[PDB]
Design a protein around this ligand. Structure first.
Ligand SMILES: *[C@@H]1O[C@H](CO)[C@@H](O[C@@H]2O[C@H](CO)[C@@H](O[C@@H]3O[C@H](CO[C@H]4O[C@H](CO[C@H]5O[C@H](CO)[C@@H](O)[C@H](O)[C@@H]5O[C@H]5O[C@H](CO)[C@@H](O)[C@H](O)[C@@H]5O)[C@@H](O)[C@H](O)[C@@H]4O)[C@@H](O)[C@H](O[C@H]4O[C@H](CO)[C@@H](O)[C@H](O)[C@@H]4O)[C@@H]3O)[C@H](O)[C@H]2NC(C)=O)[C@H](O)[C@H]1NC(C)=O
Ligand SMILES: *[C@@H]1O[C@H](CO)[C@@H](O[C@@H]2O[C@H](CO)[C@@H](O[C@@H]3O[C@H](CO[C@H]4O[C@H](CO[C@H]5O[C@H](CO)[C@@H](O)[C@H](O)[C@@H]5O)[C@@H](O)[C@H](O[C@H]5O[C@H](CO)[C@@H](O)[C@H](O)[C@@H]5O)[C@@H]4O)[C@@H](O)[C@H](O)[C@@H]3O)[C@H](O)[C@H]2NC(C)=O)[C@H](O)[C@H]1NC(C)=O
Ligand SMILES: OC[C@H]1O[C@H](O)[C@@H](O)[C@@H](O)[C@@H]1O
Ligand SMILES: [Ca+2]
Length: 340
């Protein structure tokens, strides 16, 4: 195919806003989580339209100031994670011990339009919950990645000591949660890429936990058992490398095991043998048209499965992480005909 892939803008939010992650509903609508100015889920209805309707689903202020990740559990139910944050500044740290997991339930006829929302569990001993992925064989349970500052504080943040990365399981029926994998440098950051996270987005495919690390360039996978624990010898495997700040990723389209991952102001495709290609954004003729991509997911309707919907949070190409211009957006990239 010709690169860069075709792309179009679906929607911009206001200056100061930040769209952080995305889940596509069985009906094809997009659900996106925001981190600023508030922790909300917005829906983009019928996103294949030139001008789709964009509507607030729910502001989770009762429990949190920001949302981070979203992931589907059982059909048309979703878990979001979030916490309180010291400010809406782009560099604000979270407030320690305030993380939570909450549920949006669109299942059933009463909830199909307006979901039922609830608090699932508080996570006061987590550091920063990030990505959410259901166990494919038991979708009422999710894994949740967890990494950022060990001692987050009000600005100015001075002690940037990172907590070691870890992965939680959460039973959304009972609310029970525990750490299932921790203490591996593949989960960690040493700020090789500047202040950032180690493990960031996660997905689960067959019996493999996959994740990207935002500091060391690697996409990893780990063999897991039925409860989410590493099968011994519990050693992560590098599946791909690129010297870029990853954020989140997906497999697709449909059944393909290509990884489509967001990196630094650019979008990448990664073959299962580790070949990485820049398909959109910086490093293509797109240049700076999509600054700050944060996550991506393929369409689910019969007529847009090859469309990769991409969330992002910058209105201009950032260089200094301390002087960025946040602006949430969602774009759509047509991957039709891409192959290695
Ligand atoms: C992955 O690897 C990690 C690292 O090993 C594992 O985590 C450890 O798990 C241990 C076992 O569960 C935990 O041990 C328990 O600790 C409890 C107290 O935890 C509280 O305090 C600690 C220490 O806080 C000090 O140090 C911090 C780090 O330097 C610092 O940020 C903090 O401010 C504190 O500093 C002050 O104090 C130190 C002296 O310690 C001074 O040096 C310093 O200057 C300051 O004045 C903290 O890390 C933790 O967050 C928490 O706040 C104890 O209460 C437990 O004791 C009970 O149980 C014991 C049996 O285990 C028993 O003997 C005892 O009688 C009690 O009944 C217990 O010792 C440990 O906290 C974890 N450490 C870390 C760093 O997280 C982890 O489990 C591994 N993961 C997996 C999945 O395997
Ligand atoms: C949402 O936030 C927006 C910021 O992200 C904000 O838009 C900004 O508004 C301010 C004031 O309203 C404008 O400030 C004015 O800038 C002009 C000069 O503008 C020209 O130069 C600037 C800076 O150029 C240098 O820096 C850039 C990167 O920083 C380099 O690439 C470059 O090489 C230079 O060294 C540049 O940002 C401008 O670009 C915009 O405008 C042109 C058309 O004029 C477009 O082609 C371009 O794509 C872009 O839209 C421009 O070339 C100066 O003379 C004035 O004194 C004043 O300082 C900002 O330019 C503007 N920035 C952007 C990116 O739009 C929105 O107003 C805000 N919205 C709301 C509702 O608040
Ligand atoms: O687990 C309780 C406590 O022990 C360890 C540190 O990681 C803390 O951030 C955490 O809250
Ligand atoms: Ca992320």
């Amino acid at each position: 195919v010709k690169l860069p892939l075709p792309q179009r803008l679906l929607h911009d939010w206001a200056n100061g806003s930040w769209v952080e992650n995305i889940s596509v509903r069985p009906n094809g609508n997009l659900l996106v989580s925001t981190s600023t100015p508030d922790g909300s889920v917005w829906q983009i209805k019928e996103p294949w339209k030139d001008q789709p309707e964009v509507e607030l689903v729910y502001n989770f202020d009762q429990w949190v100031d920001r949302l981070i990740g979203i992931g589907e559990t059982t059909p048309d139910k979703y878990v979001v994670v979030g916490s309180r944050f010291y400010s809406t500044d782009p560099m604000s740290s979270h407030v320690d011990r305030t993380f939570a997991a909450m549920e949006l339930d669109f299942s059933g006829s009463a909830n199909k339009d307006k979901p039922a929302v609830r608090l699932i569990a508080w996570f006061p001993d987590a550091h920063l919950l990030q990505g959410v992925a259901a166990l494919p064989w038991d979708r009422t349970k999710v894994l949740i990645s967890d990494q950022y500052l060990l001692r987050p504080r009000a600005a100015p943040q001075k002690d940037w000591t990172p907590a070691r990365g870890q992965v939680w399981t959460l039973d959304t029926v009972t609310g029970a949660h525990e750490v299932v994998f921790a203490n591996d440098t593949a989960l960690d950051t040493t700020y090789r890429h500047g202040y950032d996270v180690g493990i960031n987005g996660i997905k689960i495919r067959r019996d493999w936990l996959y994740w990207v690390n935002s500091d060391d360039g690697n996409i990893y996978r780990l063999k897991i058992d039925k409860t989410g624990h590493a099968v011994p010898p519990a050693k992560p495997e590098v599946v791909a490398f690129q010297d870029t700040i990853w954020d989140d990723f997906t497999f697709g389209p449909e059944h393909e095991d290509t990884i489509w991952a967001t990196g630094f102001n650019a979008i990448f495709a990664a073959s299962p043998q580790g070949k990485v290609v820049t398909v959109n954004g910086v490093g293509t003729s797109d240049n700076g048209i999509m600054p700050g991509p944060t996550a991506c997911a393929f369409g689910r309707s019969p007529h847009d499965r090859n469309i990769l919907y991409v969330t992002g949070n910058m209105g201009e190409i950032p260089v200094d992480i301390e002087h960025v211009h946040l602006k949430g957006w969602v774009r759509a990239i047509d991957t039709t005909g891409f192959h290695f």
